[PDB]
């Protein structure tokens, strides 16, 4: 096999050592890569701080209600640690089903933040590009690395290329 590029909807990129989301390209000069430092910085901020929100912040000191070195009456001992086993059951249940809801949301959210960037590029090029269906856009004009940085940079003034593009899109 040789060449070929693909985006999300096909597989994740294994050469992404710096950043969560990013771009790739290929033109008459050569291939390349670069990450989108804005969006990746928002997601990392939200996700990594969820551990501290799970910690209780209404601390109440607890004492001892039974002796570790002397016996306790049988009648009250049973009641003392029938409650304990029934309270440990609520916390154990409340933790499994509460982390799972945080895990579920993180997976869904981070995937939506990616489809928002793909649709941001789509509306930026306008009538000068068509989607091939594998997460990339096929530019219908010849534009160099000064254009690719523009698309990343959000400075792409499409109005100056429309004349040259629509000639190729509709095949004169």
């Amino acid at each position, epitope marked *: *096999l*040789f060449g070929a590029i693909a985006g999300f909807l096909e597989n994740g990129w294994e*050469g992404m050592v710096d950043g969560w989301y990013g771009f790739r390209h290929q033109n008459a*000069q050569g291939t*390349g*890569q670069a990450a989108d430092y804005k969006s990746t910085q928002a997601a990392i901020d939200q996700i990594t701080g969820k551990l501290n929100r799970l910690v209780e912040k209404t601390n109440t000191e607890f004492e001892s209600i039974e002796s570790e070195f002397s016996e306790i009456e049988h009648q009250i001992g049973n009641v003392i640690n029938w409650t304990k086993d029934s309270i440990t059951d609520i916390w154990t249940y409340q933790a499994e089903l509460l982390v799972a809801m945080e895990n579920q949301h993180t997976i869904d959210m981070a995937d939506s933040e990616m489809l928002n960037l793909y649709e941001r590029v789509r509306k930026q090029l306008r009538q000068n590009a068509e989607e091939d269906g594998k997460g990339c856009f096929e530019i219908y004009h010849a534009c160099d690395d000064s254009c690719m940085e523009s698309i990343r940079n959000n400075t792409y003034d499409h109005s100056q290329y429309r004349e040259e593009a629509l000639l190729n899109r509709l095949n004169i």
Partner: antibody, heavy 129, light 108 residues
């Protein structure tokens, strides 16, 4: 995990030619350039050239121009260095180092990307002449 | 053809001190075009700094460097027993890419 391996030692008389081979695994061989660095006994590190496995482009230092040759076979994932017209000064240890960025320019002579450098350097082979 | 020269001398120091190495070039180029390697006998080199200002993967914090324009420097905050080796300076400014002479390091 990445790992670059190559052939063993060799001995060749003056006027002959040698072919060192540097095989890679654990990643996609097409991307990333491939360096080639030697070190004659007691001498510093000399830079020979590098190749772009995507299309076979190569670039050599002026000192080796017309003598060195580089090749790549994606089907096997091996990068080759062929050296001709051996002299008594060609005795050294030849390495092979992968780069650390994904880019490329179809002609590494005109590449201008930023922070890059050899990584996953291989082990090196001793060629005696 | 850019040619690089390094601070000469083996620069013998005693363990626990602070060392400093410098790399100078003929003409200026961007600070991103540089890297630092550490070479120990019998082994392939290792990448320490890329771009002259960022540490490689898994590199101990004690290694750091800085510089801009004509002068580039590498600083080892504290010297340990297991880092006495030859250090190299390479530039990615313009083909050919070239290595420096190399600076040795030895205990007192």
């Amino acid at each position: 995990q990445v790992q670059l391996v190559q052939s063993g030692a060799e001995v060749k008389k003056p006027g002959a030619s040698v072919k060192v081979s540097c095989k890679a695994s654990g990643y996609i061989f097409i991307d990333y350039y491939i360096h080639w660095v030697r070190q004659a006994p007691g001498q510093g590190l000399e830079w020979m050239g590098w190749i772009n496995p995507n299309r076979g482009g190569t670039d050599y230092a002026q000192k080796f121009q017309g003598r060195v040759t580089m090749t790549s076979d994606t089907s096997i994932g091996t990068a080759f260095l062929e050296l001709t017209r051996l002299k008594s000064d060609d005795t050294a240890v030849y390495y092979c180092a992968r780069d650390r960025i994904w880019g490329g320019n179809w002609n590494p002579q005109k590449d201008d990307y930023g922070d890059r450098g050899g990584d996953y350097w291989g082990q090196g082979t001793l060629v005696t002449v | 053809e850019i040619v690089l020269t390094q601070s000469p001398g083996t620069l013998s120091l005693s363990p626990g001190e602070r060392a400093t190495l410098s790399c100078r070039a003929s003409q200026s180029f961007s600070s991103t075009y540089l890297a630092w390697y550490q070479h120990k006998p019998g082994q392939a080199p290792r990448l320490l700094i890329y771009g002259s200002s960022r540490r490689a993967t898994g590199i101990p914090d004690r290694f750091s460097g800085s510089g801009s324009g004509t002068d580039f420097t590498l600083t080892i905050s504290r010297l340990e027993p297991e880092d006495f080796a030859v250090y190299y300076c390479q530039q990615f400014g313009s083909s050919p890419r070239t290595f420096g002479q190399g600076t040795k390091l030895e205990v007192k």
